Symmetry: D2
Subunit: 299 residues, 4 copies
């Protein structure tokens, strides 16, 4: 339940926010720590070729020891806020190793660890047992040339370069449950319940609750209230065969694909969840994040 | 998954809304069918002596065959005649394991009454002989420590004002950590079944009964940011008065007896180990969405 | 209060939705009934050029008498909730009283029913009917050139051909009341309260209440509840001098323009309201439209 | 928009929250200031009887000069020391024309108490001699027909449950036309001032006090569509129980005496002709937005 290391971890993949000068010293210190304890370090192609770190030769003594990015990765460290873990999930479409994320200034949700005294935290997580949460992920299959994507926070079917009132049908196990008008629909995981789905008047869901959230974006009906459906159900969103001005689908703020007549978007609960490492335990960590980030019940 | 019958049912409990004349003839017809197919039927000790049915010819012979249920395992199949209130009473009757229940809406279509009364002959024969689909709706076990009561709740538990006047203020602990202190009218801790109950009126999200969760929803919170949340099924909530406020609170169970909670009293809420099996007409998903469309007008446009 | 005809009206401007065949026959009937009572009828040039109106020689007898389009004294709208917006767009100054018919969709701005329209038209022209002076917003866009558009339903400052939040500041009397993030902001009239602003969770506002509505579209803050401000105050919206991804502004759900740094959008309550003719009285019409169009509390 | 005093103000009424020891020294200092500049001071009967004010003989030198107010053109200016409750009590005292009111907050910024106690010398002198900015907050005239009562309210009037329970369905007529039949916990009819009051907790939009309107807001409505609305100032609402429902309702006036309303009772609400002038620190817009930011955390991010 907490942490099952079959064999002692030896590979670390460190993902950096990139295009940010504030992270150079933290990345350098963390890499020195990881290389000190005889543990292999992996770095993305674009991160090792960063000109700012290329110019610095003092760190170069460990640059030559950086392997370049399966199952070869065994432990992921994220340096950033709420975007580094999304990129990490994008990188691994299959089984993803345990990930711990450090917040360098903004506490967020997916970055519970504080950078201060990271020595002991890293040593404890590698050697000892920490607590993990198996955040659910959505498998999304787009039929136009079928492509599979993995979504952590939400998938948004909305307007785009063109902007008229969209009208899209949602089928659930083959039964047409609703047609949604307005600015669009959000299908989200419990992890993304505090993401954009929260801004659309949707309830916040702990990541341990297996569910799929359907939330509107400014629905034209005063009664369309956000709902949740069981994790194992298969959603299928497609254009109603009555409306022009085809829609656009986005996957956690990533490549927006235009969906037209005859296109289908199938959403299911993926079998490959994301283990996120928590500082103390899921409940207190989640509630502290709620209190500190969106000011849930400050009064 | 659908219906695993053992020792195919011989005992059937029929619960009526009571104090409603419109249910008399459906009750007669259901009793006649249940007597017809060699089926033992239990009726409560408060519905038998009920007038009208007491002084009703052509049915006394049926009455003599009604063995009286008392407060087990002498019940194997429950039939509810009414809307959205008969099943709550049925849940109140069985604090432990509850047999499968189907409820008929006699005019008022609801959320716990999938089956329609018309052509109930085939539906009853199919459910007894064949296999239908069931949903294991979750229930909350609530312990009130002043003495412990250990009530069971199906729709929601509401901690609010009452005979007191103003400004309820209560702390909520979750696994011993003080997650929040809620002010305003009160708090609602509800099951997914109660997502469409009173908790829905408070701005909460509708939850399918197959999603294991516990809903915490405010009732007019003084803070503009206190948004309804859900927590995992297995976590233990503990609600109690903050040790700063007078005007002690009142707690209601599924819209039933309201107990006054004061300083030193605690309300422990957990997910019960005895869910309620409710029989659906076709399947949980389509039945739930059709109920949402017909009853609350979820997305009519 | 009801209708002050200084002189009996001699001019009608009939505005048609266009690109809809269902309106042809009612348009013919209305035009014949207006022409038969010795009263001049105005139609836009783009309206009297359709192939449908050209082919029908039977109507040609009155097509010649159509005077193409300060000179208008009475406006009739045939359509739903879009014809009145177009009419308001055409009249940037003092707009004559407008009475609108709903051919199928009751809407909010089209209370009149087309059945037995002879009596209604005669009662409006000769007798006294009730009017509502719907408020309008004067919106002046200052670039790094002034536009001075007039808005009836709402003005929306949001994303568009752009991609991201476009955090934007709102000043009120020159004081920075707030910075809004998320999808965007809506500044609406009470008439537009039942418009797109209603989809964002804003309260429904009676047209007789002088106010300006500020409503978010999916705000990242859980507390940014929609507000209203006095009619006579001057709003000034402009991008914060910290954010890229310049925003887009749209008036009445129509042509959108990109606003960047150095741009300003000044919103005030216009001095030229829109008189809309109601069938019974403002209260009953507003509540009937609420119950029939947006499926209000009736249950 | 500005306070034209005409004649020089000579009388002040000081209203204290009472049953609070922290206000004693501010009350003493304010009273010495008010008596110093040859300006008559009025104190309520029940305020000048406290043990704290009786024991302090040092203040007695000015206690003898305290004129006593009785339940009315004697009062020309009101000073309230407290938070969000002193102004409501002042409004309750004056059912007719209300003299200008300045409110000080001793710790909680609130909404109706913009003035800060620190350096009150200059503020009081500027208010008395010079001209400040005022806002004419709207009040609602509410008449209860059983015997008429003729109450005046500032924040809201709430028609809901109480020592009773359950829905208590109630009809709202508006200019003689039945607009809606509200169910749920009840309805709130509020002034723009009450937009930040209890009505805010029910999901209603905040309204600046310069917008003439009357707010109708549900309290947990059983219908998902009954979203709060506003109506013009000159309207006449008339709320009464539907002739179909038992479980009569209860009416509360800004959190005050709750009266039963049963079949045959009526509650008529209109915009009063006697608004409350509240003195602002800088101007209505900035003061209102600063209060929204500080008190309810409107858009803190």
């Amino acid at each position: 339940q907490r942490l099952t290391w079959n064999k002692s971890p030896k590979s670390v993949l460190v993902i950096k926010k990139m295009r940010d000068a504030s992270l150079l010293q933290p990345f350098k210190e963390l890499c020195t720590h990881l290389m000190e304890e005889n543990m292999i370090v992996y770095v993305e192609k674009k991160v090792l070729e960063d000109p700012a770190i290329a110019s610095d030769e003092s760190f170069g003594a460990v640059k030559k020891k950086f392997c370049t990015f399966s199952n070869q990765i065994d432990f992921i460290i994220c340096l950033g806020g709420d975007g580094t873990l999304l990129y990490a999930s994008s990188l691994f479409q299959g089984s993803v190793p345990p990930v711990m994320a450090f917040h360098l200034g903004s506490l967020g949700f997916l970055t519970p660890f504080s950078f201060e005294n990271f020595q002991s935290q890293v040593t404890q997580v590698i050697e000892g047992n920490a607590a993990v949460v198996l955040r659910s992920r959505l498998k999304v299959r787009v039929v136009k040339q079928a492509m599979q994507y993995q979504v952590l926070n939400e998938v948004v079917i909305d307007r785009g370069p063109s902007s008229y009132l969209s009208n899209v049908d949602v089928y659930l196990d083959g039964h047409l449950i609703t047609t949604v008008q307005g600015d669009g629909v959000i299908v989200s995981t419990p992890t993304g319940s505090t993401a954009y789905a929260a801004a659309a008047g949707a309830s916040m869901i702990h990541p341990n609750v297996p569910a799929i959230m359907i939330t509107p974006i400014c629905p034209h009906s005063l009664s369309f209230r956000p709902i949740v459906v069981p994790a194992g159900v298969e959603l299928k969103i497609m254009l109603s065969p009555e409306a022009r001005n085809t829609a656009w689908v986005s996957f956690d703020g990533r490549k927006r694909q235009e969906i037209r007549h005859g296109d289908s978007i199938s959403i299911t609960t993926s079998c490959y969840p994301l283990p996120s490492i928590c500082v103390r335990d899921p409940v207190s960590d989640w509630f502290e994040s709620l209190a500190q980030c969106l000011h849930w019940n400050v009064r």
